[PDB]
Structures are given as C-alpha cells and as structure tokens.
C-alpha cells in the first residue's frame, strides 16, 4: 500500500519481525498479476511461523 | 583386568552403534529441504511434497 518505490538496484528492505504477521490481508491490498512461491505454498503461509 | 569380558561387550557396542546410526540417519536430508516430514507437508505444495 505504498506509492514511493526505489529503483531495481536499491532494495529498501524492511525487516518484518517480532510481530505476528498474517499473510491473508495481502490478497485484499491490490490485484496481483504474478504469485510465485518457491519452497512455500500460498495456502499454508498462515500456519507457518517463519 | 577389565578386557577379559571383551567379546561379550563388543556384541553390545555394535548393536548400540547400529541403533544410534539408524536413529541419527533420520535427521539427514536425502535431497529434501529438511528432514521433518511435517515441515515438508506444511511448506511445499502436495506435488513437490510428494
């Protein structure tokens, strides 16, 4: 839900930790055109606590 | 002399080593992302999990 984004050489990585993340709200933020989960499955991202 | 009961005490060390190796070879990754079946079933999708 951001507007300002850096270029490809920059990352602006924000380490999300110490808080219980829910991967069910990301499907209501914006309609995505690509969803490639390597190693993990989109359906079971909720129960998995990385 | 504590080396007289050696033959009988080597039928036990071999069995213990065999059991210890058979148990330790469960935590070795044989080509998977981890060695826990629950982790394989939780992270990966059913196709790659198989």
Structure description:
This is part of a larger assembly, with two copies of chain A (50 residues). Chain A is mostly loops. Chain A contains no helices and no strands.
Key attributes of the depicted protein:
part of a larger assembly; 2 chains; 50 residues; little secondary structure; 0% helix; 0% strand
- Envelope shape of chain A: globular
Largest interface: A-B, 7 and 5 residues
Helix fraction of chain A, binned, reads under 10%
How many helices of chain A does DSSP assign?
0
Cα-to-Cα separation, first versus last residue of chain A: 23 Å
The oligomerization state is: part of a larger assembly
- Major sheet size, sense and barrel closure of chain A: none
Pairing-aware structural class of the strands and helices of chain A? little secondary structure
Number of strands of chain A: 0
PDB class: viral protein/immune system
Keywords: Antibody, viral protein, VIRAL PROTEIN-IMMUNE SYSTEM complex
Entry title: State 2 of SARS-CoV-2 XBB Variant Spike protein trimer complexed with antibody PW5-5
Chains A, B: Spike glycoprotein
